[PDB]
Amino acid sequence: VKVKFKYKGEEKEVDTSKIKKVWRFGKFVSFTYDDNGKTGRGAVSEKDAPKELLDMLARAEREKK
DNA sequence: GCGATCGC
DNA sequence: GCGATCGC
């Protein structure tokens, strides 16, 4: 699933298969992802988040140490 | 300031 | 250990 978001006001897209960590941050769903060997950070407003990312968020929470 | 991650 | 990164 492709996640579309804005990074410094510019459109960006990341596949869920590259996403690492996902968490709720206020009104946003924050995430980190693998950007060809480097950590990338992105955020999408929760109301705009696709289902696949919201499902990953749920899983992340249930299993957080 | 909000939550967490994660660079250094 | 501490502080920048992400949007606002």
Side-chain angles (χ1 to χ4, degrees):
Chain A
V1 175
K2 308 183 186 296
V3 176
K4 298 194 195 303
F5 65 105
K6 277 177 193 294
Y7 175 83
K8 291 180 171 181
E10 302 295 348
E11 252 262 5
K12 233 80 186 198
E13 178 282 332
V14 178
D15 188 293
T16 49
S17 65
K18 297 284 176 188
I19 296 182
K20 300 177 64 57
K21 302 293 177 63
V22 184
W23 65 100
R24 188 172 294 97
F25 173 47
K27 69 178 260 283
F28 301 100
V29 173
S30 296
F31 56 88
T32 57
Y33 63 95
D34 189 353
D35 181 14
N36 195 41
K38 301 178 40 59
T39 281
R41 298 171 182 279
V44 294
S45 188
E46 189 162 348
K47 65 177 179 66
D48 298 335
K51 179 65 154 187
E52 192 68 12
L53 181 68
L54 293 170
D55 288 349
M56 291 169 77
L57 175 60
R59 181 149 171 193
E61 292 164 326
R62 290 200 143 76
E63 299 166 8
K64 183 182 169 192
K65 273 54 186 183

